[PDB]
Amino acid sequence: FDTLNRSITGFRKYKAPHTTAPRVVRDRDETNFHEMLGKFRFDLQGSFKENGDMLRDSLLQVGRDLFLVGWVKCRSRFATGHIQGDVHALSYMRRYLEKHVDESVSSVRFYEENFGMP
C-alpha cells in the first residue's frame, strides 16, 4: 500500500514531455555525506490510544520539525509509514520510533531502506 498507487483510467492523463533522470552523486565523503537523501518504511505493533490519534500527532510534529516527507498511518494496535528525507533526519526518526514513543510498542520493524536518491 502507498499513497502513490493509482489504476490506469480510460481518459488520457498528461505525460511528461521528455525523460531525463538526474544522475546519482557517488563522490561523497565526510564533507558531503550529509547532503544525501534517503527513504525507508516502518511498521510498529503494540497498543495505542484514541485509535492512534496521539501517535499521529506526535509523528506529524516530529516530521514537521525534521522536514521529512512521506506518509504515516496509525490505528489502535498498529502503525505503518513510508518516510523520506535527509539521512540524519531519517536516523533521528528511527531513533524516535524505537525509543521515544509514548505508547506500548511491542515490536518495531524497518524495511526497504535506500540511500543516495536524487
Binding site: 481518459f11 488520457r12 492523463k13 498528461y14 514531455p17
Partner: protein
Amino acid sequence: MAARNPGPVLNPPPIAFPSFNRRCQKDWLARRAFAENEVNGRIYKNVYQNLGFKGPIPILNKVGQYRIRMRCISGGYSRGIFRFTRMARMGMLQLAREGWLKKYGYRPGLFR
C-alpha cells in the same frame, strides 16, 4: 469533466506583479486626484457652512473620495475586497497557499 486532453501544470502568475488593468490605473488616478484635492473640498465645505447654504460641489463628482473603489491588488477585480487583505478571493487563496502568511499569524488550521 475528465478532460480528454489534459495540458501541462502551469506555474501560477507572480503575486506582486499583476497584469495590466486600465481600470486599476484609473482607480489609482482617482485616488491621487482625491489626495491632491482633499483640502479644496474642505475649503468648499467650510465656506458653505459659514454662509449657511447647502450647495453642491460638482468637482467632487470627479475628484472625490467616493470615486475610489477597493479593487483586488493581485487580480484587479472590484468586488469582494476587504481592507485587511486588499485582495479578492483568488488573490487571497494564492497568497495563503504559497506560504506568505505563515509569518503574519495566519492559522490555516482554524475554521472559525
